Amino acid sequence: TNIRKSHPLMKIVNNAFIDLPAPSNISSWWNFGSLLGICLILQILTGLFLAMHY
Amino acid sequence: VPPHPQDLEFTRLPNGLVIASLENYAPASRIGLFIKAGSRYENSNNLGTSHLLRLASSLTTKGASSFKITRGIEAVGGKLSVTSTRENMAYTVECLRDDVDILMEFLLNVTTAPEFRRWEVAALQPQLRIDKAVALQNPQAHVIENLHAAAYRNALANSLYCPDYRIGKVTPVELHDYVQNHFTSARMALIGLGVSHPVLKQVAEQFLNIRGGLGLSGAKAKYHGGEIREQNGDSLVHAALVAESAAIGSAEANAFSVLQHVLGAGPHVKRGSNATSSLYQAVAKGVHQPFDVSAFNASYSDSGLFGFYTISQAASAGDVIKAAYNQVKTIAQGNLSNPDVQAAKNKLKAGYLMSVESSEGFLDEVGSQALAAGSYTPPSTVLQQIDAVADADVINAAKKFVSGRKSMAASGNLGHTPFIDEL
């Protein structure tokens, strides 16, 4: 049996960006959701390194 | 002292329709449209159509949507029912005096303006399964259904419930076709309680005028005979043994009716030995443990099935059946006393009297009479007809059951249930 589907944790990850069905159809205007995510972490990440000195 | 007991008014319209009413003066009204549309009119290519039909009494009509029928009728606390037998369907509607206008309309819409929308009938098919499951929970339902399929080659052999293979398979056109070729004037009758003849007659002349179906006994039951056995591990063995008898309406049908009360047909005292029941007593002699028996009598427009129905422990099935049979044989041989027939006649008479005591049972009698005989026969004269049965008639009846080709259905652990040729 595929552990990628029954493990309490992976489920979430499978549902997030692996098996989740998406429109064959979306275009570049749908990228800004990842970009906002990326933005959020990178912001959190540099932001933190500044806090070790600020 | 109650009021003036009105007389029932009966009327045959030229187009064949029958209208009958009784001004009740009762607080509630009851109206039925009875139709020559039962399962006997189905055929080998459309079985179950009248079952599904029986269950579509609230799908949308032209003058009233599903939602409206339901809400409308319950808003006045009325009911809409449909009853089927092998010969008729009967749409019955009930409510208080002041509300017949609303119910009548609903009634006319269903019976003469059903739309049988493709999707509404898809959503209904599954009921056929539920409905049947609930019915088939009594062993008698299955027995009697098999009994009719073994007894008749064709019409009356049809089932009152949809064959599983048709579930989900009966189509909107089959429903439309069925209504329009059986729900016509010449095969209908409109009965009412708490209603007036003029109102009925107006409704009838304004809304119940259609023709284009068929008109005859669309086939005519061919009695065949034969037997159907279904092994199952029910705890007890149910079985019915029967032979062709007489069509409703003939004098011979009353001989049979009297025969049934001589042999026994249901108990009259709570938890009694069935002292005066001659079948019961005859089995009891030779048989220990639990069992039941009664004469079975079923008559139709052009045929009838008569005999008995026994329920017994698997091992005593044969013993129960044979004693039962021999009993009947004993009355065909001549062994019947006048005081015996006299007591039966009493049960029958008192019985009929009682059966049309309430309004739902009177509506039904008037309605079935209308369709079977195109007339109304008062109690005094049914009683008079029952008295006309001579002892010899009852004996010949028995002679006719005994010497006639038989039909048998039984279900249970059949290890000791005999086949017909072993009787």
Binding site: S24, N25, S27 | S65, F67, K68, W119
Partner: protein
Amino acid sequence: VSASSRWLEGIRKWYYNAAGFNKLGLMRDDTIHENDDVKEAIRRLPENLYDDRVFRIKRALDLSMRQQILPKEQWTKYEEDKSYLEPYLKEVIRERKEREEWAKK
């Protein structure tokens, strides 16, 4: 029938061609927003319509992904645009409204 009725028809034919779904092979009704009423009417379509609607929308979603369109001679010609879903949608709305109306008394 007017000279100006052809004008309104002309403004409509104009919008249609502008709206553009026809280049993707869609039909007007293939582009309705799906809501409860619309979902129920989609449910009531007979097999062939439903199947055809599915194929259409698949063909568009497909085009839309390649960002292409159909050859001009295969676009949905206004006036050959069948309003296949209106009657059901209209009936579904009627019955809802009857309910809505019953709920007031």
